[PDB]
Design a binder for this molecule. Structure first.
Ligand SMILES: Nc1ncnc2c1ncn2[C@@H]1O[C@H](COP(=O)(O)OP(=O)(O)OP(=O)(O)O)[C@@H](O)[C@H]1O
Ligand SMILES: Nc1ncnc2c1ncn2[C@@H]1O[C@H](COP(=O)(O)OP(=O)(O)OP(=O)(O)O)[C@@H](O)[C@H]1O
Ligand SMILES: [Mg+2]
Ligand SMILES: [Mg+2]
Lengths: 503, 392, 100
């Protein structure tokens, strides 16, 4: 067998081995230098088309030779020396002079059309040509370039739900011509979304098939029934002809996929909402968080999709209302546009209302999102939650959104000696796992719930449990701006009477 | 160094961990494997406590030097056992045969699911013919029958296990390497390696000697500890040191490279397997003070069952042999000892009643008529450990 | 053309021909001793990196010379004699003995 370098070469120099070459020409020279057999030459020698004899010669070859020597000699003697010269050049820009391989022997090989070909076949979706999140798509691509050297690695593009992670992977693999061709040879992009225990195996059933040749999809067996040890062994075998192959695992929920990815020594991009699935991997884990859209980015995003920019003061405010409600959320923002047909600042404000008196369901629409409304998504983020954590979250509704508030002020509504740090532990798990909360260490340990993460709970928790938590708070009321609420003034949560009376 | 990785991956060997590499052990494993590539068939037992780190060391011992694979042995087959059912020892070897099967004719794989043991065995070796010097890591054996099969199949085996006595199944010579609790110095190294702050003051080191005492050198629970200290400050490190006394191992249970949320999920099994009578012996050890070397007679007091109670000692040996739950010591006088990881679990697991009943059952026999073991003039007072007894 | 011995030498002494050498230095001396062509020197003379000029000098050279003379008789003159000495030593531990 060879390896990723020697097989990446047979793959890079493939546009060429198709235009002029023939495995019949090399069979005699290789039955000889002791690499193949008399069935090998039979199998590659009786093939109707040449792309067959070529794909079998390159498959059979990668297994048989201790190295990439005899092939060069063959190309040279066969008057196809313009070939054996290219491959010997490539093998040299690796051992002696490293680095130089991508700029010199790999860059000219770039081909956007091939990228399409490669994108489509790796089941990569189309990217958002309209608005592009500059910062992020860039930083993704960067951290992927840094790692094409690495043998196996996890990249976690983790964020809120509908926060826009999956779209960025579409763009980060679609802008530059480097990631595919230069840094990685092929792409495999598979959506997970697995919840059952059979899901982590079913996933890897469709990887193997993402790998397998166009030939022998006919022969695809009842692989449906075969052990995990075998699908795994069966994959890492069919993985020899996958040099520098990247893996996008769009939407991982189960840390069992991450465990398989690391037994299979894979190179993975990973979109997920729950970040802790990475604790499954003892390895080079690097992270990129898809934050809520900054206030300025929201403007850009609106303009990009024909949305009218403010003038009057209570019009930039009409729009700060949407941005506050949406709290910079790609998915629900998009649902907004599709649903602000009139475009008027007026009908834009109509909706700003519908959002307070109907939650996310006021703007649920047909969108490029698989989901009618962000509530359909978050459903899951909440089911997965530790039974005890499901409780903690459920009571957060009472807290006023968009306000930085102390741990003790939370200890009042949340279920469970004298030290309630346990509240904080739950609230961390809570931001780590769907980014539902928001942690902020100093000046003092305080969390905060945004609005999208709120009107979710508003029209979703037991109409009773809202009112019970409110009363359970007013009891602890007495007990004993850019400024956090002081401990001399907790007795009055009354500052937010405004944002409390609306219950 | 690129051919190994091909061979490691195909033999289903896990990835290599480098952050912390137990020098001594990975070395001694590799050594004793080199000595044997000559041998025709042999057992190497890398035994130890649950999550003692055995399986990780086999990952490293076959991943450091490239001699073991290529030079000493041609190929690798690493299979996780964990078999409890009686069909498990056959199912194991089914995959083994499948592993022997090349990529070609994994399509033709038959309903081998239904075919006698004599045939899977005869068939396996039929495929084995095309296999020279193939080591067989059997990660996590808990059934002696697996070994028995390994010896009918004249195999070359590395074996990670918790129960050491499964080796009595093999008449052939079996060498052994025990994965001990992490020494006090190794614990430091392990902490630093994973960004853990080293003491600058006595209190600081004591906060850390508390973790090492609680963890008692258990990597798995140590790892769960780290993953659970976001602040990491000596402070939040001590917070946890508490959580451990008032919640057992469940205070630090976390998502870890371990298949297990907490060491209690592992030990569960080690305890089920136990002789029905031995399950009893273990269950009462909770009353005993941990990390204290204590006499056999002082144990004869809580443990169930003429006038010679050596039977207590026999159970306590089986007890250290089988998951390394107890500690064994011959002289100055025959004494055992229970560590804290092996204790906190019991403390927060065994019937809440049976704890208090064993404590009283000790008092009845209590009255009877430091680097120093407790003398027979002073057993009447287990009161030295009143401290570590009042906390019940 | 050369052969396996004379080409195995240019390959064995390769870790060295990379640390200190330059094909531009030899082009004039070889267009001369009749072993190159004015396209040959063009091809090796306009190359951005030296590992390029070196890989082309060693490829082009192995085809053109009847022997490995006019390259020992060059590292000598170029103050790179620590090179032409290594290669002449190698050609001798094969020319004067029938065993390997
Ligand atoms: N850059 C963008 N341009 C246009 N729409 C976007 C963009 N980013 C996100 N969206 C909106 O979000 C929807 C898809 O969101 P995306 O899949 O990118 O988020 P996500 O983090 O993958 O959510 P999930 O984790 O649930 O897959 C699109 O239909 C679109 O409405
Ligand atoms: N050298 C090490 N470096 C880092 N972590 C380790 C090491 N050794 C053990 N661990 C911890 O233990 C976990 C796995 O333990 P390991 O499998 O090595 O023990 P084990 O003896 O196999 O237990 P079992 O017999 O139950 O398989 C890892 O997830 C890690 O948390
Ligand atoms: Mg998506
Ligand atoms: Mg293990």
């Amino acid at each position: 067998m060879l390896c990723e370098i020697e097989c990446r070469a047979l793959s890079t120099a493939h546009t060429r081995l198709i235009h002029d070459f023939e495995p019949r020409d090399a069979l005699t020279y290789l039955e000889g230098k002791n690499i193949f057999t008399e069935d090998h030459s039979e199998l590659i020698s009786k093939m109707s088309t040449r792309l067959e004899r070529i794909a079998n010669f390159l498959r059979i070859y990668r297994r048989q030779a201790s190295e990439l020597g005899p092939l060069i000699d063959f190309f040279n003697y066969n008057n196809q020396s313009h070939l054996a010269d290219f491959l010997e050049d490539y093998i040299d820009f690796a051992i002696n002079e490293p680095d130089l391989l991508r700029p010199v022997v790999i860059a000219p090989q770039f081909s956007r059309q091939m990228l399409d070909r490669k994108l489509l076949l790796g089941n990569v979706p189309k990217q958002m040509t309209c608005y592009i999140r500059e910062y992020h798509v860039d930083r993704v691509i960067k951290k992927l370039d840094e790692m094409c050297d690495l043998d196996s690695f996890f990249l976690f593009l983790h964020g809120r739900a509908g926060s826009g992670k999956s779209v960025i992977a579409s763009q980060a693999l679609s802008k530059s011509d480097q990631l595919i061709g230069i840094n990685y040879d092929s792409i495999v992009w598979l959506k997970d979304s697995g919840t059952a225990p059979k899901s982590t195996f079913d996933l890897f059933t469709d990887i193997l098939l993402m790998l397998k040749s166009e030939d022998d999809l006919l022969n695809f067996p009842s692989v449906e029934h075969v052990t995990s040890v075998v699908l795994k062994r069966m994959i890492c075998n069919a993985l020899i002809d996958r040099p520098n192959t990247l893996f996008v695992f769009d939407d991982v929920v189960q840390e069992e996929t991450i465990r398989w990815a690391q037994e299979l020594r894979l190179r993975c991009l990973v979109t997920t909402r729950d970040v802790e699935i990475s604790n499954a991997a003892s390895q080079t884990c690097e992270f990129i968080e898809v934050t809520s859209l900054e206030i300025d980015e929201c403007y850009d995003f609106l303009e990009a999709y024909g949305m009218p920019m403010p003038v009057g003061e209570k019009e930039e405010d009409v729009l700060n209302k949407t941005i506050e409600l949406s709290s910079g959320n790609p998915a629900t923002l998009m649902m907004f546009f599709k649903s602000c047909e009139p475009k008027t600042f007026e009908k834009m404000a109509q909706l700003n209302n519908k959002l307070e008196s109907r939650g996310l369901v006021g703007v649920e629409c047909i969108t490029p999102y698989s989901y009618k409304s962000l509530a359909m998504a978050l459903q899951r983020c909440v089911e997965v939650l530790s039974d005890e954590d499901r409780s903690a979250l459920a009571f957060a509704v009472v807290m006023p959104p968009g306000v930085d508030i102390p741990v003790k002020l939370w200890s009042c509504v949340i279920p469970v000696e004298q030290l309630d740090d346990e509240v904080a532990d739950r609230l961390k798990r809570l931001s780590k796992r769907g980014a539902l909360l928001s942690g902020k260490r100093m000046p003092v340990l305080t969390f905060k719930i945004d609005h999208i993460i709120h009107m979710f709970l508003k029209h979703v928790v037991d109409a009773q449990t809202i009112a019970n938590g409110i009363s359970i708070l007013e009891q602890r009321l007495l007990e004993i701006e850019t400024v956090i609420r002081p401990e001399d003034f907790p007795k009055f949560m009354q500052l937010h009477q405004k944002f409390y009376d609306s219950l």
